[PDB]
Structure 1
Amino acid sequence: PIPEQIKLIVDKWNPNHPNCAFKTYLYNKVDEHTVPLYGPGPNEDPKEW
Protein backbone atom coordinates (compact mmCIF):
# COMPACT_ATOMS: atom_id res chain seq x y z
CA PRO A 1 0.00 0.00 0.00
CA ILE A 2 3.06 2.26 -0.28
CA PRO A 3 3.03 3.30 -3.95
CA GLU A 4 -0.65 4.23 -3.60
CA GLN A 5 -0.31 6.78 -0.80
CA ILE A 6 2.58 8.36 -2.66
CA LYS A 7 0.57 8.66 -5.87
CA LEU A 8 -2.39 9.96 -3.90
CA ILE A 9 -0.20 12.60 -2.26
CA VAL A 10 1.28 13.50 -5.63
CA ASP A 11 -2.34 13.72 -6.79
CA LYS A 12 -3.38 15.89 -3.80
CA TRP A 13 -0.70 18.50 -4.48
CA ASN A 14 -1.79 19.17 -8.08
CA PRO A 15 -4.07 21.31 -10.31
CA ASN A 16 -5.25 18.26 -12.29
CA HIS A 17 -8.17 17.82 -9.87
CA PRO A 18 -7.86 14.14 -8.92
CA ASN A 19 -9.25 14.90 -5.46
CA CYS A 20 -7.12 18.05 -5.31
CA ALA A 21 -7.71 18.48 -1.54
CA PHE A 22 -7.54 22.24 -2.13
CA LYS A 23 -11.08 22.31 -3.45
CA THR A 24 -12.99 25.43 -2.48
CA TYR A 25 -15.53 27.35 -4.52
CA LEU A 26 -15.91 31.11 -4.52
CA TYR A 27 -19.07 32.80 -5.78
CA ASN A 28 -18.54 35.46 -8.42
CA LYS A 29 -21.50 37.81 -8.94
CA VAL A 30 -22.91 38.00 -12.47
CA ASP A 31 -26.03 39.93 -13.43
CA GLU A 32 -28.76 38.30 -15.50
CA HIS A 33 -29.35 37.30 -18.15
CA THR A 34 -25.78 35.97 -18.17
CA VAL A 35 -26.53 33.25 -15.60
CA PRO A 36 -27.16 30.71 -18.41
CA LEU A 37 -23.53 31.17 -19.43
CA TYR A 38 -20.92 29.59 -17.13
CA GLY A 39 -20.54 26.81 -17.79
CA PRO A 40 -17.48 25.14 -16.18
CA GLY A 41 -14.65 23.61 -18.21
CA PRO A 42 -12.07 20.81 -18.27
CA ASN A 43 -12.20 18.92 -14.96
CA GLU A 44 -15.40 20.08 -13.24
CA ASP A 45 -17.54 17.50 -11.47
CA PRO A 46 -21.19 18.52 -11.93
CA LYS A 47 -21.56 17.19 -8.38
CA GLU A 48 -19.31 19.90 -6.93
CA TRP A 49 -20.74 22.54 -9.27
Structure 2
Amino acid sequence: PIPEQIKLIVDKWNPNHPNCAFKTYLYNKVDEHTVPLYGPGPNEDPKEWEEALQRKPAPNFIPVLCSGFPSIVARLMLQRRVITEFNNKLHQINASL
Protein backbone atom coordinates (compact mmCIF):
# COMPACT_ATOMS: atom_id res chain seq x y z
CA PRO A 1 0.00 0.00 0.00
CA ILE A 2 3.06 2.26 -0.28
CA PRO A 3 3.03 3.31 -3.95
CA GLU A 4 -0.65 4.23 -3.60
CA GLN A 5 -0.32 6.78 -0.79
CA ILE A 6 2.58 8.36 -2.66
CA LYS A 7 0.57 8.66 -5.87
CA LEU A 8 -2.40 9.96 -3.89
CA ILE A 9 -0.20 12.60 -2.25
CA VAL A 10 1.28 13.51 -5.63
CA ASP A 11 -2.34 13.72 -6.78
CA LYS A 12 -3.38 15.89 -3.79
CA TRP A 13 -0.71 18.51 -4.47
CA ASN A 14 -1.80 19.18 -8.07
CA PRO A 15 -4.08 21.31 -10.30
CA ASN A 16 -5.26 18.26 -12.28
CA HIS A 17 -8.17 17.82 -9.86
CA PRO A 18 -7.86 14.14 -8.92
CA ASN A 19 -9.26 14.90 -5.46
CA CYS A 20 -7.12 18.05 -5.30
CA ALA A 21 -7.72 18.48 -1.53
CA PHE A 22 -7.54 22.24 -2.12
CA LYS A 23 -11.08 22.31 -3.44
CA THR A 24 -13.00 25.42 -2.47
CA TYR A 25 -15.54 27.34 -4.51
CA LEU A 26 -15.93 31.11 -4.51
CA TYR A 27 -19.08 32.79 -5.77
CA ASN A 28 -18.55 35.45 -8.41
CA LYS A 29 -21.51 37.80 -8.92
CA VAL A 30 -22.92 37.99 -12.45
CA ASP A 31 -26.04 39.92 -13.42
CA GLU A 32 -28.77 38.30 -15.49
CA HIS A 33 -29.36 37.30 -18.13
CA THR A 34 -25.80 35.97 -18.15
CA VAL A 35 -26.54 33.25 -15.59
CA PRO A 36 -27.17 30.71 -18.40
CA LEU A 37 -23.54 31.17 -19.42
CA TYR A 38 -20.93 29.59 -17.12
CA GLY A 39 -20.54 26.81 -17.78
CA PRO A 40 -17.49 25.15 -16.17
CA GLY A 41 -14.65 23.61 -18.20
CA PRO A 42 -12.08 20.81 -18.26
CA ASN A 43 -12.21 18.92 -14.95
CA GLU A 44 -15.40 20.07 -13.23
CA ASP A 45 -17.54 17.50 -11.47
CA PRO A 46 -21.20 18.52 -11.92
CA LYS A 47 -21.56 17.18 -8.37
CA GLU A 48 -19.32 19.89 -6.93
CA TRP A 49 -20.75 22.54 -9.26
CA GLU A 50 -24.37 21.78 -8.42
CA GLU A 51 -23.58 21.34 -4.73
CA ALA A 52 -22.03 24.80 -4.92
CA LEU A 53 -25.08 26.19 -6.71
CA GLN A 54 -27.21 24.39 -4.11
CA ARG A 55 -26.10 26.40 -1.07
CA LYS A 56 -26.25 29.67 -2.98
CA PRO A 57 -25.99 32.86 -0.89
CA ALA A 58 -28.03 35.07 -3.21
CA PRO A 59 -29.27 34.90 -6.82
CA ASN A 60 -27.14 36.17 -9.72
CA PHE A 61 -24.07 34.48 -8.18
CA ILE A 62 -22.04 31.88 -10.07
CA PRO A 63 -19.52 29.63 -8.36
CA VAL A 64 -15.81 29.72 -9.22
CA LEU A 65 -13.28 26.91 -8.95
CA CYS A 66 -10.38 27.67 -6.61
CA SER A 67 -7.92 24.80 -6.88
CA GLY A 68 -4.91 25.45 -4.67
CA PHE A 69 -2.85 28.56 -4.07
CA PRO A 70 -2.25 30.34 -7.39
CA SER A 71 -6.04 30.63 -7.67
CA ILE A 72 -6.45 32.28 -4.26
CA VAL A 73 -3.52 34.55 -5.15
CA ALA A 74 -5.38 35.47 -8.34
CA ARG A 75 -8.57 36.08 -6.36
CA LEU A 76 -6.54 38.45 -4.20
CA MET A 77 -5.16 40.13 -7.36
CA LEU A 78 -8.72 40.83 -8.46
CA GLN A 79 -9.65 41.96 -4.93
CA ARG A 80 -6.93 44.60 -5.02
CA ARG A 81 -7.82 45.59 -8.58
CA VAL A 82 -11.36 46.24 -7.31
CA ILE A 83 -10.08 47.79 -4.07
CA THR A 84 -8.52 50.62 -6.05
CA GLU A 85 -11.65 51.10 -8.16
CA PHE A 86 -13.73 51.27 -4.98
CA ASN A 87 -11.48 53.87 -3.39
CA ASN A 88 -11.44 55.90 -6.62
CA LYS A 89 -15.22 55.97 -7.03
CA LEU A 90 -15.55 56.76 -3.35
CA HIS A 91 -13.16 59.70 -3.78
CA GLN A 92 -15.17 60.88 -6.78
CA ILE A 93 -18.27 60.94 -4.57
CA ASN A 94 -16.26 62.74 -1.90
CA ALA A 95 -15.10 65.37 -4.41
CA SER A 96 -18.59 66.05 -5.79
CA LEU A 97 -19.91 66.38 -2.24
Q: What is the TM-score when the length of structure 1 is the normalising length? A: 1.00
Q: Deviations over 1:1-49 (max 9, x none)?
A: 0000000000000000000000000000000000000000000000000
Q: Would you say how many aligned residue pairs link Structure 1 and Structure 2?
A: 49
Greater Rg by CA:
2
Detail structure 1 runs of 4+ shifted over 4 Å in the superposition.
Answer: none
| Bigger relative CO (Cα 8 Å, ≥ 6 apart) | 2
Q: Which runs of 5+ in 1 are unaligned?
A: none
Percent identical: 100
Larger strand share, 1 or 2: 2
Q: What is the TM-score when the length of structure 2 is the normalising length? A: 0.51
RMSD: 0.0
